[PDB]
Amino acid sequence: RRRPIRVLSLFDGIATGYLVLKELGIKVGKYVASEVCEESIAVGTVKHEGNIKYVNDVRNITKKNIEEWGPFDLVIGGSPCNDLSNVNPARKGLYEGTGRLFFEFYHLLNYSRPKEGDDRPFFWMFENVVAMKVGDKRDISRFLECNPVMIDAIKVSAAHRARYFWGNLPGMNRPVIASKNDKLELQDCLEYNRIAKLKKVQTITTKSNSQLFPVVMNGKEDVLWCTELERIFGFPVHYTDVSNMGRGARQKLLGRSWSVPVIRHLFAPLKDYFACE
Amino acid sequence: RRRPIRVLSLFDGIATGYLVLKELGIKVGKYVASEVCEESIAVGTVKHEGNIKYVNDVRNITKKNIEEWGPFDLVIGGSPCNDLSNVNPARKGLYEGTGRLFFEFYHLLNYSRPKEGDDRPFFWMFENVVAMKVGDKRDISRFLECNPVMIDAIKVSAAHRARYFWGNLPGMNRPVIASKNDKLELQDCLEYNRIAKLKKVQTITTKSNSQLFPVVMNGKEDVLWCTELERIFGFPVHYTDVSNMGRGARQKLLGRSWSVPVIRHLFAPLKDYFACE
Amino acid sequence: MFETVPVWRRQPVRVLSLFEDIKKELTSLGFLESGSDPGQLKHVVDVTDTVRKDVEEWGPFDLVYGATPPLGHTCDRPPSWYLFQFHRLLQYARPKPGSPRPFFWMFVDNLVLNKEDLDVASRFLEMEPVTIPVRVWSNIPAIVSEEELSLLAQNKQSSPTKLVKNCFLPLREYFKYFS
Amino acid sequence: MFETVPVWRRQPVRVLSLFEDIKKELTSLGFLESGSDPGQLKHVVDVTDTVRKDVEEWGPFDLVYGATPPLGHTCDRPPSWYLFQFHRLLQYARPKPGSPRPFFWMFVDNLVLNKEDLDVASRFLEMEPVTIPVRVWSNIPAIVSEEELSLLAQNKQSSPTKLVKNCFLPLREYFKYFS
Ligand SMILES: Nc1ncnc2c1ncn2[C@@H]1O[C@H](CSCC[C@H](N)C(=O)O)[C@@H](O)[C@H]1O
Ligand SMILES: Nc1ncnc2c1ncn2[C@@H]1O[C@H](CSCC[C@H](N)C(=O)O)[C@@H](O)[C@H]1O
Secondary structure (H helix, E strand, O other), X not given: OOOOEEEEEEOOOOOHHHHHHHHOOEOEEEEEEEOOOHHHHXXXXXXXXXXXXXXXXXXXXXXXXXXXXXOOOEEEEOOOOOOOOOOOOOOOOOOOOOHHHHHHHHHHXXXXXXXXXXXXXXXXXXXXXXXXOHHHHHXXXXXHXXXXXXXXXXXXXXXXXXXXXXXXXXXXXOOOOOOOOOOOOHHHHOOOOEEEOOOOEOOOOOOXXXXXXXXXXXXXXXXXXXXXXXXXXXXXXXXXXXXOOOHHHHHHHHHOOOOHXXXXXXXXXXXXXXXXX | OOOOEEEEEEOOOOOHHHHHHXXXXXXEEEEEEEOOOHHHHXXXXXXXXXXOEEOOOHHHOOHHHHHHHOOXXXXXXXXXXXXXXXXXXXXXXXXXXXXXXHHHHXXXXXXXXXXXXXXXOOEEEEEEEOOOOHHHHHHHHHHHOOOOEEEEHHHOOOEOOEEEEXXXXXXXXXXXXXXXXXXXXXXXXXXXXXXXXXXXEOOOXXXXXXXXXXXXXOOEEEOOOHHHHHHHHOOOOOOOOOOOXXXXXXXXXXXXXXXXXXXXXXXXXXXXXXXXX | OOOOOOOXXXXXXXXXXXXXXXXXXXXXXXXXXXXXXXXXXXXXOOOOOOOHHHHHHOOOOOEEEEEOOOOOOOOOOOHHHHXXXXXXXXXXXXXXXXXXXXXXXXXXXXXXXXXXXXHHHHHHHOOOOXXXXXXXXXXXXXXXXXXXXXXXXHHHHHOOOOOHHXXXXXXXXXXXXXX | OOOOOOOOOOOOOOEEEEOOOXXXXXXXXXXOOOOOXXXXXXXXXXXXXXXXXXXXXXXXXXXXXXEOOOOOOOOOXXXXXXXXXXXHHHHHHOOOOXXXXXXXXXXXXXXXXXXXXXXXXXXXXXXXXXXXOOEEXXXXXXXXXXXXHHHHHHHHHHOOOOOHHHHHHHHHHOOOOOO
């Protein structure tokens, strides 16, 4: 029959995968997260009450670990884009620095794959930015043996966020339609007595410059608050109010995260393959 | 019959008075707050959605203002304790520095008082620290024409906070008993995977050094988080997650604030004198 | 303003002199009786433990006088202390709102209040001080730039003026006169 | 280990030589056939656009060989590029789980992999490299410190070794001899 989903999340960040699966009502049986950022782990630990098994560095996951922790029904992950983006001048490409971490996903993906005779359902997805060289986008497609689909979060959220999505999830190419409760304009994500200048926000990153003064309060311009950044990305309010993180720390975690309504769109077809509440 | 309450709050801070009155279910008709801290005003404005009329400096409130903004049914306030506490070596007493701000309460209290022969209900309350010299405690009692009641937050919260309370509220001298939902021990105020060393915490103030490492997480010492400070004082969680405030900024506002469960104990008899929800 | 009183109805004023006694001063016009050993004047200097009932028990008052210590004197207490205590005792001596009667109050400073205290003094006494070359806050009927006052205050600081009597002239139009 | 086969059952290996061709090398021992113009060795150097179906139609294969470029020479691609591409093409050539036929693979580096790259190499190929005074990762049953190795690497980099033949000896116990 249908049984809960066992998920392996590499480069888990602030546990967006576990968040979306529970928001969909999917019964999460096991969620193994490979994650090294101390503040990021504190978020997924506090906001999900220890339901996430953290295993720290992805390069320490042995073949025996995938067998013991397995079997896995869903393998998601997004390698860091610091050495893969056209923005940073000091790139290290796909093969040096943190760019080489993509192959760790490719490595553990084939370890988690079901054998040929095992026809059990198995899904996976890899995410990375679009601002990568054609030579690195081609090579990622050559290793994952499929082609990515581009889904911009502007269609379903209040910010630009064009990302590539490799994977075998059901209906990844389907048209993206915005849900009812999606905050599609910046004014929807703001707090009280604060006025939004623009309808959408330029792509938000880890740095403060994500215009630079897009809100008016008491007839004076002011930046976005952390609570407003969380609403832009679709996370719950105060999702990053953890571990005494200031404005700069919380924007770092949010700047590298996934757009929650986008991942909800991608993970939605999983409801018909596993148990739900 | 009963009518909603019209409150004048001098030195409002983070609007603890409005919070307690609404938590008691009392219909708040008008809440005039005298408050100059930008970050503090941002809290009471966002967390209460503009129901608070801010009037900025207390020394600019004229006699005509009390007439126009009036009538008032409740006049609360707590002058700054920086120049009134034995902690600061460089005191300026009750008559210099910020100590003279108490007389602004005394001034506006007599302005808001109903004239002789007006039997309408009128309540008021002044709060200050206990660690003040006897010469200034006597003078405050000489001006307010009554004696203070000492209420320590240790009975109803998880922290020491002995404060003096002048006022004519009904039953201020009654024994303080803790309610059902009061988190009176530190472990009740902590987050997940966080272990409390002590049952109660030393009096929390504006500075970080308030023992200094009272929590254990993953077998390692760590300070209190902002969310945990809010639970200690009885405020709602993320009550200070406003205006990109870091750890130090939120502790500053919370360190000088009122213990919410203590103010609830004091304001509770007001339910039988004004309208309720 | 108050209305003037017929001369045959006027009675001797009873005054409350705080900090600085003006009994010897007030006799110059004759508001008090030279023979009355108790006198209509009640003078107190240390008021830290005076209660509202004390002023009520001392009887009514028509003029309430308060003054800062002279310039050529040490500051036993902060300069703001005299204004706050004057304001507290003044509200005790005011007649009830139900029974109107001529009532006056005066606070005079001998260049002892600084700039910070003047703003507080004017706010509490509800009027800007007028300069008499002293500063005068009073509800009495009728009644040189700082540049000069600031430099004069420095010379005076290196080394009990009673010119304020001229402000007491219209108070004879409400109380009796002795000769 | 794989179980040995009677000599009359053994057949010529078909090998996949990546990056570095060993056709002339394999003739010296005789795993390859002298004269067979449709050689059993398939040699490719640029594999960036190689798909799984390409290897399948080029298959089957019994030995998969991959090697980094010789010392010095050029850094046409990063040294990690050859390991990742070798690992990707190897998974294409492996027999299906419903075929226990003999399958071998070898990857050798000529001191071109850095210190961090060795850890990646050992993790992907699932064994620590053994030192032959080159390093060899392989499942063949066949199988000095770092400072001298590093300083020697610095001298040659400042200014095509084929000693690996001795490692191919136990492959004679599963395949033909001078065939
Ligand atoms: N060697 C490594 N092992 C595991 N995680 C790593 C890693 N190097 C970087 N990371 C992770 O890469 C994460 C960013 S990738 C973005 C995380 C995810 N998209 C989200 O939902 O937020 C960082 O938070 C960091 O913890
Ligand atoms: N001149 C002034 N006018 C009005 N408010 C003042 C002031 N000087 C200081 N304050 C206020 O004094 C406040 C601390 S008193 C504590 C606030 C209150 N007990 C609470 O519930 O938090 C500060 O936040 C500041 O805003």
